[PDB]
Design a protein around this ligand. Structure first.
Ligand SMILES: O=C(COP(=O)(O)O)[C@H](O)[C@H](O)COP(=O)(O)O
Ligand SMILES: O=C(COP(=O)(O)O)[C@H](O)[C@H](O)COP(=O)(O)O
Ligand SMILES: [Zn+2]
Ligand SMILES: [Zn+2]
Lengths: 461, 462
């Protein structure tokens, strides 16, 4: 184990990942047992009892009570079980805080203070929406989830104009509430773009939004970063700038690489500092020195004289990522066998606050189907290979955040969910009519830290 | 025959502008009829261009005229083409000549920003109904310099409450960082106005279609959104944030406004109001100076409860302005618009058009995607089946998206947005489209400058 790895953290995170993934993967084995029993006299009783033992909840009775006519409707049970499993999963995230990083947690308070010391008053991260990066924040960089805005997008192509609007909203809160700090204080908004690549099969397992070309994914991520900065500098008077960070992550090993920037965001696309070289460089050092050597390495990999706080923060991410490297060596032989797509359901809408595990969710950002149906089609094709290949429906969970202070915003969000549902049912009528596609509608009040809310389903009784 | 408060020079200028722009669209059909009668003449392509330049000021597409002999004169395309080119010319004249004399930096806009600040308001954000009979409410009905107000038309005056909260935040941010319009600590409020409409000559049928032509429901739905916005701002920010509200309606037969004067905190009676027609009658035999004081006293007593002094000052100036438009309609339109219903020349889709300030020029449908604007665009398309399709002419559609020129790659996002909308429209009206009865022009406009909108695509190709 590396002298800088948090052993027990690695165990706790492993215990979490295996627990949630077990809940989802126990479904098929249970449904296989039930299918064998559907002609027995006490079928309904024995099925309810199997499901309680195994999944911890019971099944919709109408589907069991009528299995003798049509036969037992497995496609609908499977979707329903995935939805129910997602609800229990999500509710327990807000209830138990498995990551120890909710608002007000010691970890979150600690990191908020550390970000301020480094010269940053907000940390806004866009990873590619790829399911293989959903654990980037909690596992890959070991940051409390609540100390961070996470804004995922296919190929890390975030909305430049909406990010400027988030900068404006952030400054305004500094002006009126001095939250997180006074407006006059010499801190900067920090925008990060996290792309990914595959070290084991770079040609086919890379970022599919950019044809699995590492250079294209790195350079489009930077193009957006620059454009955001240029946009702030052009739209407001006086100082008016932001800090930038372009990072990638290997989906085979979870090692990150940082393009350490100069003070003004000068980034080189062809030179990076890979956490694996960091890992090997500090492996024989006692902890205190190893931390020093990570510092000097990040300093030395800067594109031009770097900002001191940027050097400190990047060194912390390397220090943090070294644990995740050991994580994948411990529990995944140094390379995930699910090198590609193995997600358990599709998520569409706004990013899921509670989803922080690798290959759990295929996320497609969209305000409307009319836009980013391309990104949704990609997932649907993927789940044709994962689920329809073996007779199982494609499960979709729609999510929209709303401001639970705006009167009627919750109502607006719910109706937004049904607007998406109608559009999905229209886009794939073959699958929807063959019962090979179902949607769950969830809304989440983003003004406090409570669980999302299930507001409708294609499964109807 | 003229009210002491009426501004006769302003009335003449605004009449000259409305007249010239409606004449340009109204010449299209008579020109096209003349070309149709000439289509067999040996010199037809030459004659057609010459007439087209003399009468309309732009040329017609060669290939339409060139092939008239085999495939027949394609009037459908010609007509759409001419509406688009006319839209183009008058749109750029608006930016180039400032017919309303209200562009940024104009004397008229300077004065009205000072007056607004003086009344206690640092921003006037108005949502009229998107109905094309209200497009002139700002520049004509209220004689407000267009550049010093935010105009956000929506069907039924149902503006986006969350986005308005975001506008308020953007506004506050400018105040903090730049002191524009004023320093953040100054004691001014953001003012959101909802402007509904109704028809006094046919209430049952010519009112707001979004609300079933039901005046009381149009008024109460506008009020409801205003209160929601106010409740959103108060509940979303510390330290007693608030905003002011104003509900008013305009009568589309006579251009007379009526105001539900509110008390300090926004308290508004729906069931009663102050009609500009009664304010007109009540000041008519008074010198200009007493007429104004009288207007102020009438606003004052009309309030639902004790009003804010600054709000009284502003509403009385809006009444003073509206009195000129009341006289405008009475002298140039017999006192009742002869086109009481819809007579728009084209459908506008997307973001509201900065440059459209004439009555019955544009049926406007707000939308960022067709997936969400469909119902509203259906209504406009239906209206145009009566206005145009019924007589063989296409439904012309101009798409517009504003974009922040200061944001790199934003124009290209707007163009791509326009293309997405074109594709969607074409899919939703597939008969009209392949039958050549629906065309669309794509327009974008940099809202970070005062410059003409740019044409970026068209369903008329060769
Ligand atoms: O970026 C995030 C979380 O990203 P993700 O949801 O993808 O984890 C936001 O800061 C808040 O969570 C949004 O609202 P709220 O403050 O209620 O959480
Ligand atoms: O979009 C602009 C800026 O355009 P520009 O400064 O280039 O004219 C307006 O501020 C609002 O859209 C309000 O509409 P209006 O000003 O027509 O009331
Ligand atoms: Zn990707
Ligand atoms: Zn209306």
């Amino acid at each position: 184990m590396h002298p800088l790895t948090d052993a027990s953290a690695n165990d706790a995170l492993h215990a979490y990942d295996t627990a949630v993934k077990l809940a989802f993967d126990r479904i098929v084995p249970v449904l296989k047992r039930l299918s064998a029993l559907q002609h027995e006299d006490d079928f309904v009783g024995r099925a309810q009892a199997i499901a309680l033992e195994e999944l911890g909840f019971p099944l919709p009775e109408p589907i069991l009570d009528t299995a003798w006519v049509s036969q037992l409707d497995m496609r609908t049970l499977y979707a329903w079980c995935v939805f129910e499993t997602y609800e229990q999963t999500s509710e327990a995230f807000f209830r138990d805080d498995p990551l120890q990083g909710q608002p007000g947690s010691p970890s979150a308070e600690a990191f908020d203070r550390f970000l301020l010391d480094c010269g940053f008053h907000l940390l806004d991260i866009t990873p590619c929406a790829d399911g293989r990066l959903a654990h980037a924040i909690g596992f890959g960089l070991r940051l409390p989830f609540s100390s961070v805005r996470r804004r995922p997008h296919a190929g890390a192509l975030f909305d430049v104009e909406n990010t400027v609007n988030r900068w404006v909203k952030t400054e305004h809160r500094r002006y009126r509430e001095a939250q997180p700090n006074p407006a006059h204080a010499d801190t900067r908004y920090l925008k990060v773009a996290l792309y990914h690549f595959s070290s084991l099969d770079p040609q086919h397992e890379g970022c599919a939004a950019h044809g699995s070309d590492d250079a294209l994914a790195a350079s489009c991520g930077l193009s957006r970063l620059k454009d955001f900065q240029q946009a702030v500098e052009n739209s407001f008077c006086c100082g008016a700038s932001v800090d930038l960070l372009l990072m990638g992550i290997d989906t085979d090993t979870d090692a990150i690489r940082v393009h350490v920037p100069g003070m003004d965001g000068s980034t080189r696309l062809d030179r990076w500092l890979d956490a694996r070289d960091v890992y090997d460089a500090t492996l024989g050092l006692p902890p205190d020195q190893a931390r020093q050597r990570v510092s000097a390495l990040v300093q030395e990999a800067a594109a031009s004289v770097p900002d001191p706080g940027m050097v400190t923060l990047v060194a912390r991410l390397f220090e943090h990522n070294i644990s995740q490297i050991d994580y994948v060596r411990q529990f995944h032989g140094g390379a995930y066998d699910d090198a590609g797509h193995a997600e358990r359901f599709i998520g569409v809408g706004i990013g899921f606050k509670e989803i922080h595990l690798r290959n759990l969710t295929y996320f497609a950002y969209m305000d409307t189907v009319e836009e980013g149906a391309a990104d949704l089609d990609v997932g649907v094709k993927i789940f044709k290979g994962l689920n329809v290949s073996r007779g199982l429906p494609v499960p979709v969970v729609v999510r929209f955040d709303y401001h639970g202070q705006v009167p009627g915003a919750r109502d607006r969000a719910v109706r937004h969910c049904q607007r998406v549902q109608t559009a999905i049912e229209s886009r794939y009528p073959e699958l929807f009519q063959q019962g090979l596609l179902h949607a769950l509608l969830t809304v989440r009040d983003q003004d406090r830290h409570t669980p999302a809310e299930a507001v409708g389903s294609t499964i109807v009784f």
